Each structure stands twice: as C-alpha cells, then as structure tokens.
Design a protein around this ligand. Structure first.
Ligand code: TA1
Ligand code: GTP
Ligand code: GDP
Ligand code: ADP
Ligand code: MG
Lengths: 441, 344, 427
C-alpha cells in the first residue's frame, strides 16, 4: 500500500545497493535466501514490509529493485555472491562495453540496447504495486552510465509515469579529490537535463565521508564499504515512516513539499550526526540536543560546503528511537536562538519534523555502534552554489582549449550541447543568489 | 592573417508568414539578441559584421550587393595583391545559404559577382605585356575522404575514388589526382558547378530530404605573368593566387535525430571537422594579437588541404546563415555560438 | 564479454609475447599443455579476454604471429609455452626484411598481410564483443615496423570503432643495435599517430637502468627485460579480467589520457620492484608504490619527466587497499609538484583498483603518463634522420624497393609538428 521502487546505476549505485539491501534484510529479519524464520515461528506480522520487498506464496521475499551498469563485472559479484538467491535474475548485465566515462556513450550509443528492458521491468514491478510513491535512483556524477543513462531513463519515466516522485542520491564530485578528468563535463551535462525531471536530488561527497571516518569513527584507512553503509543509514532514516510505526510519519510527498520552494532549487544536503564508534558510544549521553546541534555542525556534513557562507531555506529532521517531541521543540528553539545559522526572511517555520520508534540496526563487520536514537537531517542551502561554480570553472578551463570534446562528438554529440548546459547552469547559480536576498518594502 | 566572421538573418518565408510563426531574434545595431518567446532570458551576440535582412525598410538592410562589397571585394584585391583567400559558409537547412553564396537567377549571390568582377578587372587590366590565366577545381570531403566531382561517373557500386592528400615541401599540401580545368568566363564555371552539385552526396534523416552530408571546396588558381625581363624578354618570376570557397554541412545533433549507421558516421565526422576548423579560426584570431600558438591543421583533412590559404599572409572570411523563427531556436543558437568562438 | 586480439611481430614481439603469455597463464592457472590446474574460481570467470576454449578443458590463446623469417617462430615452438599456440596462426614467410621499412610495407609485406588479416577476421568474428586489438613491435627494425604499421592501417579501416594499442619499443639515444633506426622509426611514427588510440613507448636503456639500479642484477638478458613489459601489459587489462572497487578498461584510460588525438604516446611504469635482498626492508603500502611510480628512474621511456609537464596520468592498482590512500596521495602529487602538471586540466590524474593482486604479491601498481618530455624521444630522431638525409646516405635501399623522397619529408614534417604540439603545453 506504500511502495517505493529503487533503481541503481553504475558501480556506485550497485555498491550502495548492496549496502542498503543488506541493511533492509537485517531490519526485517529477511535472510539472504529471502526466507523468514519468524513468520513460521509465531505466524503473523508484515516485518518483511511490502514497501521494499515483495512476497510470493513460498514465504520468500524478493526486492523491488533493478540493477544496470552497462558493464558486467559488478553485477556478476551479486549473481555470484551471498545475495544471489534474493534478487530476481533480471539484473541488467549488459556488459558488451562500458561508457568509458563519457556521457555521450551512456545516452545514445550504448545507452540504447538496454533501456527498453529497464522500462519493461519497471512496468512489471509497478503493476505489482498498488499505491506507489517514489522512484529512488542512486547514480554517480562523473561516470558515463550515471550521467547519461540516468538522464535518459528519467526523461522516459517523466513521460511514462508523470505525477510520481523521482528522487536521486548522487555522488557529487569533490573539489580536490576526483578519479577522472571528465568529471566536470559529465556533471554539467547531467544537471542540465536532470533538473526539469527530478523532484529532489540529494548529493554527497566522498571527501566529506572520508573526513567523517577519521574524526568520528576513528578509521584512518577506510574503503567504500565504510561509506555506503552510512548512505544506507541515510536512506533507512528516510524510508522508515512507510515501514515502521511512529508518531509523526513523513512520507515522500512531504520532502518534496517542504524543501522545494521553487521547482529549480531542489538540491539539498544530508547529515547523519551519530557516526561514533562503540568506544565513543559510551562517554556520551546521545540526546536530541547534541544530535540536532551536530546536524548543523560543519565537519559533520556530507558535502564539502560551509553553510555559514550561505542561508537555510528549509530543513527536514527525521528522528528514530526513543524520542519525545518536547526535546525536538527545545532543540529547534535553541538552533533558532543562534546567529551563525541564518534562515531566510521568507521562511520563519523552516522546520519539518518526523519521529519514529524503530531505532537503527547494527551491521556485523561494521563500524557504527548500537544506539537508542538516531537522526537524519536534509537541508536546502544557498551555499551549494559554491560547488556548482567550482565545477563550472573547471569546465570553462578545459572547454576553452576544447579538450576531451572529440571523444564526445565521436559518439553522437555536437559542440553546442556543452554551451547549452553551462548557460543553463549559469542561471541556477543566479537563482540560488536571488533567493538569498532579503526582501525590501 | 585576420579572419572576419559575419551573420545574415533570413526574412520570413511564405509558410511561416501564414502560420504567424514567432520572431525570436532582434538587432540593436551590431549586437544581435535572441529572445526565447518570453520564457526566462535572452542571449546577446556580437560580431565584426552583421547583416539584418529581415525586412526591406529597416536601417542597415543588407542587399546582395552589400554582402559582396563588404565580404568579397577585399578578397579580390588581396588576391590581385598576390596572396590567397578562403571564404567559408555555415548554416543548417532552412537558413539562407544557397541564396547567399550562389543566389537565384535574378538575385545573385557572392560567387557570380566574384567571377564577373574578376573577369571584368582582368579584361580591363590585360595589356600588350601582362596576361592572366585561371584554372578551377571542385572537390568534396565525405567521412574524412576526398572525392572529385567534375568527373562523369559511369555505372558502378560507386565511381567515387578516395584520393589521397600529400605534402609537397615548398608548395605545401595538395591532392594527388585532382582535375584542374581552365576558365575564361563564368558560364564555364556554371557548367561544372551544376554537374558537381549534382554529384555532391546528399541524404535524408527525417528532415528536409536534400540536405548535404559533405563538405565542398571550389578553388581557383590564378596566374599573373606581369613580369618580362627587359634584358632578353623571356619569362621570369610569376605570381600565383589561390581562392578557396567552401560550403560546409550542419552540426546535426544525433539524439533528437534518432540516426543509425551511415547517417551517424556522416554526422560524427562533420562534428569533428567543424570543431577542428573552430580551433584554427580561434587560434588565428589569437595569432593576430601577437601570441605564440599552434594551429593544428593536421587533425582534419579540410584544414590540411588549406594550410596555406588560411595561415601566413592570407585572408579568411566566414558567414553564418541563421533563421529567425522560433521553431529553429536551437540551431540558430548553435550557429551563433560557433561563430562567436570563431571570433574569440 | 570483452576480447583482445594480440598480434605480435618481429624478434622483439615474439620474444615479448612468449613471456607475456608465460605470465598470463600463471595468473589464470593455465599450463603449457593448454590445461587448467588453478585454485581460485575468479581465474576462469573472464578467461575469454585472452583465451578461447577447446574440447578437453583446454585453453588456446588468441595470438597472431606475423614474422617474415622462421628463425624466431621456431624458438617459440621449440620452447616452454609454445605448444599452447594455434599452429594455423604462425604466419611467416621468407625473404626477410633486411632491416628495411620498405620491404615490410610494400614488397615483402603486402605479399603476406592478407594471410594475416585472414586470421584476424577469424579471431574477431568469433567474439561476442571485441574491445580492441594489441600489438608488440620494435621501431627501428623492419618487419615489426613495416608490417605492423600496415596491419594497423588495414585494421583501422575495417575496425575503426574499436581500440588499437601498440606496445612499441622505441629506439635509444646512446645504444643502437641497428644503423637504420631513424629512417624506420620516423616512417612508423608517421603511420602510428594517425592510426592509433594509445601506444606505450618503451626504450631498452630505461629497462637496463631499472635492472641495474633497482633490481640490482649483474647479467640482465632480454628475458629479464620483457619480464617487465609483460607486467605492464597485464596491469593495463587487469580490471577487464578481475573485479575491483573502481573498475576500468582501455577506453576509459584512452578517454582520460588523450586530450587531443595526436597525443597518445605514453611512458609506462610498474611498481613494486626490489632487489631479492632488499625485499625484507620495505613496507608494502600505497605511498611507497606511488614514490616508485612517479620516480624517473622507473619509467621505461628513457626520458626525464621533470623536463616537462604531465598532461594526464593514470594509476592502476591491484590489491585489497583503501580508496582514501590513493586519492590523498594523488592529490598530494598534484599539489606539491604542481610545476610538473598543467593548469588547464585541474585533476591531471585518475585511478583504477582491482581486488586481485599478482601471484606472489600483496599489492601491485601500474603507471601510465602522457608527458611533453616525449618530444626529446623524437627531437633526437629528427637530428639523426636529417643528418643522414641531407645527403642521402642509406637511401638507395629504400627507393629501390618502390619509394620516393617526398615520403620521407612527409614523416619528418609530421614528427616535427608533433614536437611543436607538445611544446605548446611546456612553458
Ligand atoms: C616473495 C617475493 O616477493 O619474491 C618476489 C621478489 O623477489 C620480487 C623481487 C619479484 C621477482 O621478480 C624478479 O625476479 C624479476 C627479475 C627480473 C626482472 C623483473 C623481475 C620474482 O621473480 C617475481 C615473483 O612474483 C611474481 O611472479 C609475479 O606474480 C609476477 N610473476 C611472473 O612474472 C611470472 C613469470 C614467469 C612465470 C610465472 C610468473 C607477475 C608480475 C606482474 C604480473 C603478473 C605476474 C615473486 C614473488 C618474487 C620473485 C619470484 C623473486 C619482483 O617481480 C615483479 C615483477 O613484481 C621483482 O621485483 C618484484 C618484487 C618481488 O619482491
Ligand atoms: N561513494 C561511492 N562512490 C563510488 C563508488 N564507486 C565509484 N564511486 C564514484 O563514482 C565515480 C565514477 O563512477 P563509476 O565508478 O565510473 O561508475 P559509472 O557511473 O557506472 O561509470 P562507468 O562504469 O564508466 O559507466 C568515481 O569517480 C567514484 O568517485 C562507491 O562504491 N561508493
Ligand atoms: N626488448 C627487446 N628488444 C629487442 C629484442 N630483440 C631485439 N630487440 C630490439 O629490436 C631492435 C631490432 O628490431 P628487430 O628485432 O630487428 O625487429 P624486426 O626487424 O621485426 O625483426 C633492436 O634495437 C633491439 O634492441 C628482445 O628480445 N627484447
Ligand atoms: N536575404 C534574403 N532575402 C529574401 N529571401 C531570402 C534571403 N535569404 C534567404 N531567403 C529565402 O530563404 C530560402 C532559403 O532556402 P534554401 O536555399 O534551401 O536555404 P539553404 O540553402 O540554407 O538550405 C530561399 O527560398 C529564399 O527565398
Ligand atoms: Mg563501471
């Protein structure tokens, strides 16, 4: 009755999914073979909740997702791994050839020959759904698949489905760190087309989570498994009100309703404040005040962007565990007393709140500790324009020498689709500026 | 080595007159604005030359005589000086390019005026001592392969021989096996050009069906025998001048136009070629300011054949035809941004 | 699944490939009888990249061999790992090239290239999806230069969409085992840069110096030299065979490492490399490997990168490691040594990681670099060339086999223009 279809594009998407679905299987008691001992123990309940996991007559539970990479090396670890008996074998392993970190190859040339299968499977999944609300895509800027095929798929989906939420958890490029020269071009060409289609486009940055690991969890040599688990925790804090019973439920039609004032400024940021280890899990009270103060704390954000260089337009706070609204009222009043945290002059409320009773789960072989309460915050700022301008400068440095363009126009692109995207992204940077101006009488 | 970039906006056709199609581009003297109908914003473009041919009574109107007398006659006089010239031409189907360079049988373009003024100035400058002799050539570029067009094919799978380009050390690059034919009047040029453009390769994706899918160069080599050594009076040093006039193809986005196979290659190469040309033009506008740069002629065939007509003490002219309708608002933007980068 | 076709020409190519296969087989668990006797199961998931299947669990490599004197193919046959090859792919002829680029391109090479393409089409049409070709040849000589460049010209027409690399062994400044090195190398560069996507310039002086200073060997023969080129070849195509945290392939590197098409000549490098005694006193970590990679006493180009700027760099790691270490170290390189990196490319580096190291190491790394310094490798030849060509020293062995003088000036001017292209981004 309350369903959300997940889509995973690229290496980043599939690995975030392998974290997310491990988490979801742990929360609901589902084993990797898809069975449940609890429902045969007592005979009742919908712990394997119909929001994410389907069900068939054999007491098995299959996920509501589909993978695609245009490269077979990744999905062939799922098909040949611990979670092989869970996923429907229709995972797109279209491993003829990859995009070669080129938007043009994941949009027209190699982006065809796959997409129709994806649409067919998504229709097959939706027809099994009654009250669908959402299309949670996980992709990555910089890559060719996550830049192009994502754009094409969302183009098609905004026609086929329409009045349905379509969110996005992306890996935004870092200012210093990066794994490719062609990160900028693909990013600026993705944001140009994935701005009229998407409804809320979350964003993270691996530099920030690296900083978080060696300062909160005390890991000096992490890997992507230590990051995608935090992302899974974010998604779980987001997608819990549809699953578990709580006081102040918050569905997906509310995030897009209380964080997108105007339809172009739907690029928020995330934070999950308790990232402490089992050693520091003690020595600390872990109350709502500390956590909510940590959410607005720089050096705990998931995008390298100092919000003190900007202003807050809205912020949703989704809490889990032993929480009482009295403490949230107190903490919001505390944050509104302060002066480093500037809210606009057209949003005095500036706060949506969501509360749930189910605390987070602990993944074995993990880094986080067990806690009685946890928090996620999603925040819209005028400060993320800085990152856009940073990327645009790199674009304007390379595109003047016309570097790396022949690889794009050699795959179905003209030279104008670049300048159409730097001038489309040079207006949103102006919009985020206009919204920041205080009004005048 | 100065390159001039220009633009000519066509006036409305009878169809888009009847359908009351919307005007998106306007002129403020030398600036040209393009206004999305009212959507959000407008872009502004500046060029060394601008021809507002939208309606007859606007000030700054540009008749064909103005286009010739502003773009071409400098090429003529700089050729008679003894140097070389390259005239370009860009525009998608439905922009006013054929009307510009050739024209109509009662509305001349650039080419007839060029040739007629040429032969007139020759026949009035021809003396008892001086003389002149001209020789033409007409070829095309298709998928980075050269083809000659003056030949009367038989019947085959294809009578299109892929000639090879070479690099003679002194003269520079050239084409091995190029038909070069004499000329003394313009009708003799028409007789070849009709055949050539009939042999030009054209194809239909879903749009206007007779759209060129190749580049086409029309070159004239002209000789001056002004020189007679009075010590014995048998011939001595002599001047030669190369005049290239090239009609290019369209950018053509390959996604909105769901293309396959040979319609993709034909488009990919054209995109590459134009980009290379862009860099060259840009570098030359950066070369005149006095900097140190590299002109990569070798990344394309068209540039490698014309290394000597652009570089050095030579002249270059580029004109970009654009439509003012609102249906063709993306194509015009592409054309104008291309020519702007050619400016800077 | 992706699929490479490995062509190899001349004495150099035969003797490099015969070691390359000797290593890939060890990595995948194959024996010289074609049979499989491995331990891990990831050794077979992607054995279709280099090998093809047969009846009794045999595995025959997709190797093509294109010499013009049988003296070398017999050494491969009469060798350890020679039986695994397909005998119908040992193309050869007679009437050798005489160390002459003409014979290998017009006379004694055109009479055989069709018999080579006959095998290339067999081994390409028998693929689900080909990624590209490979080649191992030595400039300076004959066959490997001529027939190699001719096969490149003839493969780029049939298969333009696909990839074509060339692990070329460039000449050396100091030593010269052949007297007509310049005239052949120049005419090979004239036909490579127009018709290649990423080639890896190698020089034997660098490998001798690596074998002498680092590995501290006293009697390095060519078997110990090709033992390094094999390693690099393997490292390029690791993420095409084994999994990883951030995968890659040939086209990715070619996209990131080729800003402009004429500039695809790379300096390669492999790390770790230590003398047998000194392996007890070294910590196997990412930064030690990065130090060894970005050092100039390990690059095989015989060219000091500090005399130029890194236009673009690629690092392919192999082992269970962190993704913070790689990014941190590469950013540190970009920041400290900024003078050796361009500014109109902010991040002049990229990364790939595979989770499966080599047979005896806990970690490995491979390095590719596009550097302007490569002009030194050609600016030298254009001195050797023209000095010999100013008065036509050894030229009658080239005209007489159906050539003309203009074909030399063409290549000279092209090579010089490439020098001027790489100088544009130097100061
Ligand atoms: C315990 C230990 O570390 O001993 C090492 C060793 O001493 C060193 C020096 C090995 C050794 O390499 C050499 O002896 C060598 C000699 C001349 C020229 C080049 C190398 C070694 O042979 C190499 C060998 O490792 C391998 O074999 C790799 O898998 C290598 N294998 C082959 O090349 C191979 C060759 C013929 C037949 C079968 C396999 C390899 C490297 C890259 C990609 C694939 C395979 C090992 C453990 C060592 C010895 C044995 C001493 C080194 O090998 C490489 C390429 O990494 C040379 O420096 C490294 C670091 C090692 O410490
Ligand atoms: N957080 C996180 N980021 C990842 C992960 N894997 C890859 N990335 C990021 O994704 C960026 C590029 O995306 P790719 O890994 O190439 O995946 P892709 O989008 O499918 O690109 P292609 O495979 O070439 O089509 C890299 O630069 C990484 O920064 C991951 O597991 N976790
Ligand atoms: N690295 C390496 N180089 C070699 C080997 N054999 C020959 N060479 C080099 O190859 C060059 C001569 O090339 P050659 O073998 O004649 O190529 P061919 O003409 O095709 O036979 C010389 O400069 C040698 O240094 C080898 O086994 N390994
Ligand atoms: N300056 C002008 N004045 C009047 N009409 C023009 C002018 N320029 C172009 N046109 C009209 O535009 C049309 C161009 O059509 P076409 O020759 O197919 O353009 P193209 O050659 O660019 O495809 C002609 O029919 C012509 O009447
Ligand atoms: Mg990938």
């Amino acid at each position: 009755m309350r369903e959300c279809i997940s889509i995973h594009v690229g290496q980043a998407g599939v690995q975030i999914g392998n974290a997310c679905w491990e988490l979801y299987c742990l929360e609901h008691g589902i084993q990797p073979d898809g069975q449940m001992p609890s429902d045969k123990t007592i005979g009742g309940g919908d712990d394997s909740f119909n929001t994410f996991f389907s069900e068939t007559g054999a007491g098995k539970h299959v996920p509501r997702a589909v993978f695609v990479d245009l490269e077979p090396t990744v999905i062939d670890e799922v098909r040949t791994g611990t979670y092989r008996q869970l996923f429907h074998p229709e995972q797109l392993i279209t491993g003829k050839e990859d995009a070669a970190n080129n938007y043009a190859r994941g949009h027209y040339t190699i982006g065809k020959e796959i997409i129709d299968l994806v649409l067919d499977r998504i229709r097959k999944l939706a027809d099994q759904c009654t009250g669908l609300q959402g299309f949670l895509v996980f992709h990555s800027f910089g890559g060719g698949t996550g830049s192009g095929f994502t754009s094409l798929l969302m183009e098609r989906l905004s026609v086929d489905y329409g009045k349905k939420s379509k969110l996005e958890f992306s890996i935004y490029p870092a200012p210093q760190v990066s794994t490719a020269v062609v990160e900028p071009y693909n990013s600026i060409l993705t944001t140009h087309t994935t701005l009229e289609h998407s409804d809320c486009a979350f964003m993270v940055d691996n530099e920030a989570i690296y900083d978080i690991c060696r300062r909160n969890l005390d890991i000096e040599r992490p890997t992507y498994t230590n990051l995608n688990r935090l992302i899974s925790q974010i998604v779980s804090s987001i997608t819990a009100s549809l699953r578990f019973d709580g006081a102040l439920n918050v569905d997906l039609t509310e995030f897009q309703t209380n964080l997108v004032p105007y339809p172009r400024i739907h690029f928020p940021l995330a934070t999950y404040a308790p990232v402490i280890s089992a050693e520091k899990a003690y020595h600390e009270q872990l109350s709502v005040a500390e956590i909510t103060n940590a959410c607005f704390e720089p050096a705990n954000q998931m995008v390298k962007c100092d919000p003190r260089h900007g202003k807050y337009m809205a912020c949703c706070l989704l809490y889990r565990g032993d929480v009482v609204p009295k403490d949230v009222n107190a903490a919001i009043a505390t944050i509104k007393t302060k002066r480093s945290i500037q809210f606009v002059d057209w949003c005095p409320t500036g706060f949506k709140v969501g509360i749930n009773y189910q605390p987070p789960t602990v993944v074995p072989g993990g880094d986080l500790a067990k806690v009685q309460r946890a928090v996620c915050m999603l925040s819209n700022t005028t400060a993320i324009a800085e990152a856009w301008a940073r990327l645009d400068h790199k674009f304007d440095l390379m595109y003047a020498k016309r570097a790396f363009v022949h690889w794009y126009v050699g795959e179905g692109m003209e030279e104008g689709e670049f300048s159409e995207a730097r001038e489309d992204m040079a207006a949103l940077e102006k919009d985020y500026e206009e919204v920041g101006v205080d009004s005048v009488e | 080595s100065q390159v001039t970039v220009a633009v000519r906006v066509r006036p409305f056709s009878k169809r888009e007159k009847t359908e009351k199609a919307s005007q998106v581009v306007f002129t403020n003297g030398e600036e040209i604005t393009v206004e999305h109908p009212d959507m959000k914003q407008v872009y502004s473009f500046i060029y060394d030359v601008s021809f507002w041919s939208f309606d007859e009574c606007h000030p700054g109107y540009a008749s064909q005589t103005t286009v010739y007398e502003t773009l071409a006659a400098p090429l003529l006089d700089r050729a008679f000086e003894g140097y070389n010239t390259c005239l370009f031409a860009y525009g998608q189907t439905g922009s006013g390019k054929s009307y510009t360079m050739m024209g109509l049988n009662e509305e001349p373009g650039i080419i007839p005026r060029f040739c007629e003024d040429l032969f007139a100035q020759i026949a009035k400058k021809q003396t008892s001592e001086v003389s002149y002799h001209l020789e033409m050539s007409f070829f095309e570029v298709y998928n980075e392969k050269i083809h000659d067009l003056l030949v009367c094919k038989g019947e085959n799978g294809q009578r299109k021989q892929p000639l090879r380009a070479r690099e003679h050390p002194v003269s520079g690059p050239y084409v091995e096996g190029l038909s070069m034919n004499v000329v003394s009047s313009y009708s003799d040029i028409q007789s070849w050009l009709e055949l050539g453009n009939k042999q030009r390769a054209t194809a239909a994706t879903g749009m206007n069906d007779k759209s060129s899918r190749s580049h086409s160069v029309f070159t004239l080599v002209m000789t001056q025998t002004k020189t007679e050594v009075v010590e014995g009076e048998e011939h001595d040093h002599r001047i030669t001048s190369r005049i290239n006039l090239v009609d290019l193809a369209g950018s053509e986005r390959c996604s909105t136009a769901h293309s396959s196979g040979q319609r993709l290659k034909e488009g990919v190469s054209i995109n590459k070629s134009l980009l290379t040309l862009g860099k060259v033009i840009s570098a030359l506008s950066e070369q005149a300011n006095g900097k140190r740069v590299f002109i990569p002629y070798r990344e394309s065939t068209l540039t490698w054949l014309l290394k000597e007509s652009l570089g050095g003490n030579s002249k270059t002219a580029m004109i970009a035809t654009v439509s003012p309708a609102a249906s063709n608002i993306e194509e015009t933007l592409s054309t104008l941004r291309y020519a702007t980068q050619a400016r800077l | 699944m992706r699929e490479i076709v490995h062509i190899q020409a001349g004495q150099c190519g035969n003797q490099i490939g015969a070691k390359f296969w000797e290593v890939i087989s060890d990595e995948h668990g194959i024996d010289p009888t074609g049979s499989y006797h491995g331990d891990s199961d990831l050794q077979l998931e992607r054995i279709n990249v280099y090998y093809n299947e047969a009846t009794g669990n045999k595995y025959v490599p997709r190797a093509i061999l294109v010499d013009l004197e049988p003296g070398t193919m017999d050494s491969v046959r009469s060798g350890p790992f020679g039986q695994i090859f397909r005998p119908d792919n040992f193309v050869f002829g007679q009437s050798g090239a005489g160390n002459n680029w003409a014979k290998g391109h017009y006379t004694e090479g055109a009479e055989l290239v069709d018999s080579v393409l006959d095998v290339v089409r067999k081994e390409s049409e028998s693929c689900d999806c080909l990624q590209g070709f490979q080649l191992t040849h030595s400039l300076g000589g004959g066959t490997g230069s001529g027939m190699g460049t001719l096969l490149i010209s003839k493969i780029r027409e049939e298969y333009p969409d696909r990839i074509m690399n060339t692990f070329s062994v460039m000449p050396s400044p100091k030593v010269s085992d052949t007297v007509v090195e310049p005239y052949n190398a120049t005419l090979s560069v004239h036909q490579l840069v127009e018709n290649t996507d990423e080639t890896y310039c190698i020089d034997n002086e660098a490998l001798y110096d690596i074998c002498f200073r680092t590995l501290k060997l006293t009697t390095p023969t060519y078997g110990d030299l090709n033992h390094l080129v094999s390693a690099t070849m393997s490292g390029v195509t690791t993420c095409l065979r084994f999994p990883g945290q951030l995968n890659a392939d040939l086209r990715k590197l070619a996209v990131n490492m080729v800003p402009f098409p004429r500039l695809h000549f790379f300096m390669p490098g492999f790390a770790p490399l230590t003398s047998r005694g000194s392996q007890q006193y070294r910590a196997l970590t990412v930064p030690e490997l990065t130090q060894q990679m970005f050092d100039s006493k390990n690059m095989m180009a015989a060219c000091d990168p500090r005399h130029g700027r890194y236009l673009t760099v690629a690092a392919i790691f192999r082992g269970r490691m962190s993704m913070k270490e790689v990014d941190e170290q590469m950013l540190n390189v970009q920041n400290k040594n900024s003078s050796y990196f361009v500014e109109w490319i902010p991040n002049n580096v990229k990364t790939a990681v595979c989770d499966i190291p080599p047979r005896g190491l806990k970690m490995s790394a491979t390095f590719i670099g596009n550097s302007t310094a490569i002009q030194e490798l050609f600016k030298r030849i254009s001195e050797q060339f023209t000095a010999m060509f100013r008065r036509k020293a050894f030229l009658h062995w080239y005209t007489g086999e159906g050539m003309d003088e203009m074909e030399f000036t063409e290549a000279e001017s092209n090579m010089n223009d490439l020098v001027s292209e790489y100088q544009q981004y130097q100061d």
